[PDB]
Design a protein around this motif. Structure first.
Motif: not given
Lengths: 395, 171, 267, 115, 405
Positions: A115-116, A118-119
């Motif tokens: 879900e997180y 490329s952050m």
């Protein structure tokens, strides 16, 4: 609590790989060289001790420190020892015994919450992990071993009466240790082994990793080629990496035709770019690219060819007439012999690599780059006009 | 699309009139010319008859007249400061009639020094204190007396006396 | 709870940095005194000749001069005793208070200056050895086992002559008053451009200024539509149709990202 | 005016400036359990002695007798205090510089959070 | 890097363009005039161009004009003006809802919103107070309009009704932008603060107070832009600074200034071209490309005349700029990416073009600012370079100085 944390880690560790689930747990627990690092969010003191979720999970395996005597014996015998993939692999490819003696760590697996993605959490973890081994997490405050069951106790216990109980919580260390608390093992390099892909390559590229080896034979299950990238930690000699990076780049350019012809021109260009970043790593000018000499140019190209190349730049020729000079020109440019005089854009670089090295036809590149055939020829002509002027200047 | 016809409006009694006819060309209006400070750019418009109107789409210099000294000089316009009708015009630096703008004081200062031989006989050279302060600043408050949207000019006059006091109070 | 200890240490670390700037400011103010001091005479005859030029004014200035140093340096030693007391540099707590209370003469003040340095030397050996061990262990140099910092200081103090010459260097080209007269008369044994008597710490002073400058840089009514009518407008009704797919991110991700917008022993 | 008179006036202005700053600096310190980092504490103490050595050099010069115009004893203290600051402390704090920044950043966020 | 000006005004700023055309006819004999290449016929407005935008389809372009206030729609395949449509007032801003030019919403300066369709002006409505910006959400079918008043008016196209207007704490909204991936929306108040709102709910997520340790003078948020990724946010301050923010943090990652001191008008993230870490910032005077992460100037596009707006064709190197001059300048940067498909052979003729060229890299101080900044001493030295009324300076040195003063 350990089990609850263990399941969360395995959710990330098993988040993305292709079905090799079972054995890795035994490797992680029983293998002595393996260590685990977990990236966690900030801990609010108002939390009341509730475990935060893991954002990134990194498993490393300490490798290297192999005696030179064993390496020569194993290398002569052609027998591969269990473990130490990177120390053995680079030694076999580069016939270098000094590398095997070097102490290094292989990042077996790095996992982040899908879900997180490329952050930037994964890049942060690698930044901190490199920072940990460099010695920068020094203790700011002015034992974690567990005593083993004695042989006397084992003999004195009876099978019927045996009390198989979980180890007392007091003896055990804490589950999560601050980087300052535990001293790192001295290391020379950090290594990664993975199948080459555009996303993964860009991730490692931005983390200062340099390619050293690419396997020609694609893996059957995935169709991806195994690539090994190394990074040198500060305070350790970096010359050996630069020599390896130069050798790999020269090897790569020739093998673009044989088996990497399927690689996209953009992907192949990025691999060359990442290797060149190793040249920037070393401030030393002892090892540098040599500009092409007049004598070398005459050996490479006869005067007629230069006339043949020149007329094309004037548009007095057809494209097919110059097809023979293209691959040699490509080797010189990507070999950096041309020097600072000639530079090309990303699209122009992709086109030159494709025809010169991939051996692909012009129309194929028009499809690959989503360009009209007319533009690609027009871009391609501009490349030789710069090259022709440079050859004029040398003469 | 712009028209000056009174037929679309409600009657004096308040009855809703119906469309008597299609819009005619002898009752037309043309789009407003939002003059703004910049390099001079004027667009000619052919009007009823042979007469022509000049659209000051952009203008930066104008002939401003010192009434008390009875003179006139061409000066650059710095920017709009206050416009009685709509404040957004001041926000966008729109030039129209009655707008209060700031103009360079250099030509007026040079003329005063040349004529009276006094840096800014003594009794005549005396002027209003606020105007003296504005010269000391380097820019003068002026009111545009022309219509840039019609005549293509931005002439005006420097504020003085009760006029200047009132607009200073409003500023 | 460990977070609170991080804060007090964070508050603690700041205090020295402010103190570091303040003492460097004290050095900056004293800089012109050092420059002017280097310009003063060097011998008894030169000083007497200097007084002869303006006997009354020089005597008054000399008296006002002498008083200020005794007041200033006595206060400095009091600060030193207090400072080395609060930081545990001096262990004899009672002796430090006795020194602070008493009033001390110039000769006595010199003795405290010697004693304070000797205590600081002992604290130096312990502190450098302690931290050097921590850094070495943290970086794996302990596993390896680049000299210890205390050893490096000892070696460089051993090379006293070299750094002695560094201070003799007259970079500013300062000429003390009546220097030529003392040179001619043979009143300067050491000399009989590098000047033993002119003291130069300009490079160190500039480095301190550069460090201070860099840190500062680094740290830094209804008609005409004037009222809104919410009645349905037929011409624009159904002008566009919504996209049912929604934003690319999941709603849970969107809710979280907005939430953080703009900022057994388990551990 | 004699050269000495102008020089002595310059020294007088310097002292009252330094003394007033010392008055301010002593006050804030007295204003300040909070445990202090030893390394920077020595680094603070080391340069303080360097300032004292400079002042001791000043005092030796000013004596009309000028028995030791070179100020050998004052200088040697300055040499010792200068050496520790440059060679000993600076490598250690550089190795320690990041972890120092992290804690200082850690509090600054907290102080903003508290406010 | 090289910038080629395909079309525009080749004369200097001082030279008037209209007399130049009257001199241009006299010099029509000069051979270069016959050999000139015009990408798009009638790519010039009568007096000036306010805005320019490229349809998402990639085959059309739209622009708005000065006198008579008119709308120009260009067809790339035909390389010409498809049609011109006059209007009753000048256009402050507009958007193209459809992928093509068919449906577009126009905000005039007479407080009226006009809806343009294929046939013509479909409908016109008036908002309570004067407008400064405009944006539309595809998910919500709600058109968001800023205005002089504190409220940010909301219009729903699906239901054809005005809705409850978002109440900004501050008075005035200079610019509004919406992020595709998030849906997060930002508003540019006159004060140095950007108020972020949620479209899912009707709420203020948070507000960011722009901090300028360099310059203490007041400024306004003139432009805001969200990156495609969604975690990055850019602002434009009236003083002449553009801030890049990662939305999670509350501090500016990099603050890059143009230096002339003019307001920032348009900010574009060149993600599509390749090497995504490049951004555009546009003054009236100049527009500069500089690296996102490091803030190093890639290239510069300085037209002689002022820039009202700049637009970038996705996936290509060209940039269209709306200017005050009669022509509309368009720049080609071959290094960034290939030329668009429609003008394929523009690459072949790169030698003929102007190849126009320091200003972007360095900062510019006014004479008054030099005296206030105590940099009169720097004058006459290599550090400070004179540029006409004011003097250039290094960016880092200026930041240190304004801290000192």
């Amino acid at each position: 609590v350990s089990e609850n944390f263990l399941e969360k880690m395995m959710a990330l560790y098993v988040s993305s790989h292709y079905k090799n689930s079972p054995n890795d747990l035994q490797l992680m627990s029983d293998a002595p060289a393996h260590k685990l690092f977990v990236l966690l969010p900030p801990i609010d003191p108002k939390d009341g001790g509730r475990i935060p979720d893991p954002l990134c999970v990194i498993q490393i395996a300490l490798e290297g420190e192999i005696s030179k005597e064993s390496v020569r014996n194993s290398l002569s015998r052609g027998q591969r020892a269990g473990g130490d993939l990177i120390p053995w692999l680079i030694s076999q490819q580069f016939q270098d015994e000094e590398f095997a003696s070097l102490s290094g760590a292989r990042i077996v697996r790095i996992a982040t919450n899908p879900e997180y993605a490329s952050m930037g959490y994964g890049s942060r973890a690698i930044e901190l992990l490199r920072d940990y081994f460099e010695g920068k997490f020094t203790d700011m405050s002015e034992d974690y071993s567990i005593k083993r069951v004695s042989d006397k106790e084992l003999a004195k216990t009876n099978l019927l009466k045996d009390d198989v109980k979980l180890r007392d919580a007091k003896t055990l260390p804490p589950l999560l240790l601050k980087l300052s608390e535990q001293p790192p093992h001295y290391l020379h390099y950090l290594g990664v082994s993975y199948g080459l892909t555009q996303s993964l390559h860009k991730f490692w590229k931005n983390n200062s990793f340099v390619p050293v080896y690419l396997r020609q034979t694609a893996n059957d299950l995935t169709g991806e080629h195994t690539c090994v990238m190394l990074n040198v930690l500060e305070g350790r000699e970096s010359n050996w990496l630069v020599e390896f990076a130069k050798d790999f780049r020269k090897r790569f350019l020739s093998l673009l035709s044989y088996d990497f012809h399927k690689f996209t021109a953009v992907q192949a260009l990025s691999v060359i770019e990442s290797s060149k970043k190793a040249q920037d790593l070393s401030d030393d000018e002892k090892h540098d690219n040599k500009e092409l000499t007049r004598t070398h140019l005459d050996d490479i190209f006869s005067p007629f060819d230069l006339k043949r190349l020149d007329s094309y730049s004037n548009n007095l020729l057809d494209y097919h007439v110059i097809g023979d000079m293209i691959p040699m020109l490509a080797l010189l440019y990507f070999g950096d012999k041309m020097g600072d005089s000639v530079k090309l854009s990303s699209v122009q670089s992709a086109i030159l690599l494709a025809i010169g090295l991939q051996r692909k036809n012009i129309d194929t590149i028009a499809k690959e780059l989503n360009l009209p055939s007319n533009q690609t020829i027009a871009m391609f002509a501009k490349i030789m006009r710069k090259m022709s002027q440079y050859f004029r200047q040398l003469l | 699309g712009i028209s000056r016809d009174s037929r679309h409006k409600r009657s004096a009694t308040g009855a809703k009139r119906a469309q008597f006819r299609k819009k005619r060309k002898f009752e037309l209006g043309r789009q407003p010319a939002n003059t703004k400070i910049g390099a001079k750019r004027i667009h000619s418009v052919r009007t009823r008859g042979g007469n022509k109107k000049y659209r000051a789409l952009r203008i930066e210099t104008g002939n401003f007249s010192w009434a008390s000294e009875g003179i006139s000089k061409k000066t650059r316009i710095a920017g709009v400061v206050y416009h009685p009708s709509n404040n957004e015009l001041v926000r966008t630096n729109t030039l129209t009639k009655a707008a209060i703008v700031q103009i360079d004081a250099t030509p007026f200062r040079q003329w005063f020094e040349a004529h009276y031989g006094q840096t800014l006989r003594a009794a005549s050279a005396k002027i209003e204190s606020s105007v003296e302060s504005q010269f000391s600043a380097g820019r003068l408050y002026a009111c545009i007396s022309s219509r840039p949207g019609q005549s293509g000019r931005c002439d005006g006059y420097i504020l003085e006396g009760e006029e200047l006091a009132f607009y200073l109070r409003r500023l | 709870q460990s977070v609170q200890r991080d804060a007090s240490k964070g508050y603690s670390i700041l205090q020295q940095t402010k103190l570091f700037d303040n003492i460097i400011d004290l050095r900056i103010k004293l800089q012109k005194a050092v420059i002017a001091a280097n310009k003063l005479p060097l011998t008894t005859e030169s000083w007497e000749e200097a007084k002869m030029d303006d006997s009354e004014e020089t005597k008054r200035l000399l008296k006002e001069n002498e008083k200020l140093f005794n007041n200033l340096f006595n206060r400095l030693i009091n600060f030193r005793i207090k400072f080395q007391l609060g930081d545990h540099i001096t262990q004899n707590e009672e002796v430090a208070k006795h020194k602070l209370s008493k009033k001390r003469s110039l000769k006595e003040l010199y003795q405290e200056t010697n004693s304070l340095d000797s205590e600081l030397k002992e604290y130096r050996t312990a502190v450098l050895n302690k931290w050097s061990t921590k850094v070495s262990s943290a970086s794996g140099n302990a596993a390896l086992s680049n000299l210890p910092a205390d050893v490096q200081v000892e070696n460089q103090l051993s090379d006293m002559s070299r750094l002695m010459k560094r201070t003799k260097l007259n970079r500013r080209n300062i000429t003390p008053l009546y220097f030529q007269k003392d040179c001619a008369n043979g009143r300067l044994p050491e000399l009989i451009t590098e000047n033993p008597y002119v003291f130069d710490d300009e490079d160190f002073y500039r480095v301190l200024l550069n460090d201070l400058i860099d840190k500062k840089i680094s740290n830094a009514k209804a008609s005409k539509g004037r009222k809104l009518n919410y009645s349905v407008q037929d011409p624009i009704a159904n002008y566009e149709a919504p996209i049912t797919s929604g934003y690319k991110w999941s709603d849970d991700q969107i809710d979280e990202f907005f939430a953080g917008l703009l900022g057994i022993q388990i551990f | 005016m004699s050269e000495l008179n102008a020089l002595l006036k310059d020294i007088n202005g310097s002292l009252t400036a330094t003394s007033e700053s010392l008055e301010r600096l002593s006050g804030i310190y007295s204003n300040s359990p909070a445990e202090k980092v030893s390394l920077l504490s020595l680094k603070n103490g080391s340069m303080l002695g360097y300032i004292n050595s400079l002042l001791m050099l000043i005092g030796n010069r000013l004596d009309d007798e000028c028995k030791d115009p070179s100020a050998m004893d004052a200088r040697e203290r300055s040499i010792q205090h200068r050496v520790v600051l440059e060679r000993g402390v600076k490598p250690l704090e550089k190795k320690l510089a990041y972890q120092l920044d992290k804690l200082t950043r850690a509090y600054v966020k907290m102080e903003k959070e508290y406010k | 890097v090289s910038v080629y000006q395909v079309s525009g005004t080749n004369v200097s700023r001082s030279l008037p363009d209209w007399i130049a055309k009257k001199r241009k006819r006299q010099l029509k004999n000069d051979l270069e005039y016959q050999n000139r290449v015009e990408l798009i016929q009638d790519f010039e407005f009568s007096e000036a161009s306010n805005k320019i935008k490229v349809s998402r389809d990639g085959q059309y372009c739209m622009a708005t004009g000065t006198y008579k206030p008119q709308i120009h729609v260009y067809d790339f395949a035909n390389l010409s003006l498809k049609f011109d449509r006059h209007t009753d007032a000048e256009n402050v801003d507009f958007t193209i809802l459809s992928d093509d030019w068919t449906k577009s919403v126009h905000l005039q300066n007479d407080r009226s919103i006009q809806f343009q369709n294929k046939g013509g002006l479909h409908y016109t409505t008036r908002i309570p107070k004067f407008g400064r910006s405009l944006v539309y959400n595809k998910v919500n079918c709600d058109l968001y309009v800023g205005a002089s008043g504190n409220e940010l008016y909301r219009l729903n196209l699906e239901k054809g009704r005005f809705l409850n207007p978002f109440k900004l704490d501050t008075e005035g909204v200079n610019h509004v932008s919406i992020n595709e991936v998030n849906g997060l929306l930002a508003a540019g108040t006159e004060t140095n603060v950007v108020e972020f709102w949620d479209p899912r709910s009707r709420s203020r997520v948070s507000k960011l107070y722009l901090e300028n340790n360099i310059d203490n003078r007041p400024f306004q948020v003139t432009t805001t832009s969200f990156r495609n990724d969604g975690l990055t946010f850019a602002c434009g301050t009236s003083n002449g600074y553009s801030y890049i923010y990662d939305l999670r943090t509350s501090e500016p990652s990099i603050i890059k200034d143009q230096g002339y001191g003019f307001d920032i008008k348009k900010i574009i993230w060149l993600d599509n071209v390749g090497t995504e870490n490049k951004i555009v910032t546009c003054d009236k005077r100049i527009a500069k490309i500089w690296d996102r992460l490091d803030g190093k100037a890639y290239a510069s596009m300085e037209p002689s005349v002022d820039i009202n707006d700049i637009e970038h064709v996705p996936g290509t190197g060209m940039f269209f700029t709306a200017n005050e001059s009669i022509p509309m300048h368009t720049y080609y940067i071959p290094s960034l990416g290939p030329s668009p498909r429609w003008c394929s052979f523009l690459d072949s003729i790169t030698e003929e073009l102007e190849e126009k060229p320091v200003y972007s890299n360095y900062r510019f101080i006014t004479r008054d600012d030099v005296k206030k900044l105590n940099l009169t001493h720097l004058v006459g030295s290599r550090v400070l370079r004179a540029y006409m009324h004011g003097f250039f300076i290094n960016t880092e040195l200026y930041d240190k100085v304004s801290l000192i003063a």
